Write an enzyme that holds these catalytic residues in place. Structure first.
Site, short mmCIF file in Angstrom:
data_model
loop_
_atom_site.label_atom_id
_atom_site.label_comp_id
_atom_site.label_asym_id
_atom_site.label_seq_id
_atom_site.Cartn_x
_atom_site.Cartn_y
_atom_site.Cartn_z
N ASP A 1 0.80 -1.25 0.00
CA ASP A 1 0.00 0.00 0.00
C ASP A 1 0.82 1.30 0.00
O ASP A 1 0.24 2.34 0.20
CB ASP A 1 -1.04 0.05 1.15
N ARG B 1 0.97 6.83 -0.03
CA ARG B 1 0.24 5.83 0.74
C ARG B 1 -1.16 5.78 0.14
O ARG B 1 -1.86 6.81 -0.01
CB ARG B 1 0.22 6.25 2.20
N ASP C 1 -5.59 -1.01 3.88
CA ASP C 1 -4.48 -1.49 4.69
C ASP C 1 -4.14 -2.85 4.17
O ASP C 1 -4.94 -3.79 4.32
CB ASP C 1 -4.88 -1.48 6.17
N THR C 2 -2.94 -2.96 3.64
CA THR C 2 -2.33 -4.22 3.38
C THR C 2 -1.57 -4.73 4.59
O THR C 2 -1.09 -3.96 5.38
CB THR C 2 -1.39 -4.13 2.17
N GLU D 1 1.70 -5.96 6.55
CA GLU D 1 3.12 -5.63 6.39
C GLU D 1 3.77 -6.86 5.78
O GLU D 1 3.21 -7.97 5.83
CB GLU D 1 3.78 -5.21 7.74
N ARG E 1 4.05 11.38 3.51
CA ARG E 1 3.55 10.56 2.40
C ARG E 1 2.38 11.23 1.77
O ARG E 1 1.49 11.76 2.46
CB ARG E 1 3.15 9.12 2.85
C1 LIG Z 1 -3.88 5.61 5.01
C2 LIG Z 1 -3.64 6.76 5.99
C3 LIG Z 1 -2.70 6.59 6.99
N1 LIG Z 1 -2.44 7.60 7.86
C4 LIG Z 1 -1.52 7.38 8.99
C5 LIG Z 1 -2.33 6.79 10.17
C6 LIG Z 1 -1.40 5.80 10.83
O1 LIG Z 1 -0.63 6.46 11.87
P1 LIG Z 1 0.28 5.57 12.84
O2 LIG Z 1 1.60 5.35 12.11
O3 LIG Z 1 0.42 6.54 13.98
O4 LIG Z 1 -0.35 4.27 13.13
C7 LIG Z 1 -0.48 5.38 9.65
C8 LIG Z 1 -0.89 4.07 9.02
O5 LIG Z 1 -0.12 3.83 7.83
P2 LIG Z 1 0.52 2.41 7.52
O6 LIG Z 1 -0.57 1.35 7.44
O7 LIG Z 1 1.26 2.70 6.24
O8 LIG Z 1 1.44 2.07 8.68
O9 LIG Z 1 -0.56 6.39 8.68
C9 LIG Z 1 -3.13 8.82 7.75
O10 LIG Z 1 -2.90 9.74 8.59
N2 LIG Z 1 -4.02 9.04 6.77
C10 LIG Z 1 -4.31 8.06 5.86
O11 LIG Z 1 -5.22 8.31 5.03
CA LIG Z 2 -0.02 -1.28 5.94
#
Ligand SMILES: Cc1cn([C@H]2C[C@H](OP(=O)(O)O)[C@@H](COP(=O)(O)O)O2)c(=O)[nH]c1=O
Ligand SMILES: [Ca+2]
Length: 129
Positions: free
Chosen positions: A15, A29, A34-35, A37, A75
């Site tokens: 993702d 992103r 959510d994929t 890891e 991102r």
């Molecule tokens: C997909 C997405 C993730 N994020 C943030 C929330 C999560 O914060 P935390 O890192 O604090 O958990 C993280 C999840 O991304 P990943 O699934 O790439 O880890 O990215 C956003 O803020 N907005 C979005 O639309």
């Molecule tokens: Ca992920």
């Protein structure tokens, strides 16, 4: 919403992808998914699926939603298309992502994705197996 051009720089995982957008490298992103890891179950298959989709595409496009365009990590937050097919949706349709991270204002494609998730689950695909 509007599709804008970008070019692949490198596949990262299920993702996230590195694209050149307005001439600048950035990590994107994918919205509303959510994929797993890479280290988790179906993580490698999700990564491979996205990788093939983006590497085989002749035309990659970025579609921002109405909200936040970057997250707290820097991102890009967009829907990503490969030859007109949305990666975010395709991952969900195949049971390789869950609909997730649905925030007010960046949720234009929510119900499209949820419908894909319902079909993946009905088929018991991958994550839903
Ligand atoms: C997909 C997405 C993730 N994020 C943030 C929330 C999560 O914060 P935390 O890192 O604090 O958990 C993280 C999840 O991304 P990943 O699934 O790439 O880890 O990215 C956003 O803020 N907005 C979005 O639309
Ligand atoms: Ca992920």
């Amino acid at each position: 919403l509007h599709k804008e051009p970008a070019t692949l720089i490198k596949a990262i995982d299920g993702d996230t992808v590195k694209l050149m957008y307005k001439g600048q490298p950035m990590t994107f992103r994918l919205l509303l998914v959510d994929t797993p890891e890479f280290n988790e179950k179906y993580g490698p298959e999700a990564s491979a699926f996205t990788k093939k989709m983006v590497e085989n595409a002749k035309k990659i496009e970025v579609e921002f939603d109405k909200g936040q365009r970057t997250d707290k990590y820097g991102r890009g937050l967009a829907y990503i298309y490969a030859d007109g097919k949305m990666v975010d949706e395709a991952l969900v349709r195949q049971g390789l992502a869950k609909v997730a991270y649905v925030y007010k204002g960046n949720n234009t494609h929510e119900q499209l994705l949820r419908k894909a998730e319902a079909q993946a689950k009905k088929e018991k695909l991958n994550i839903w197996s």
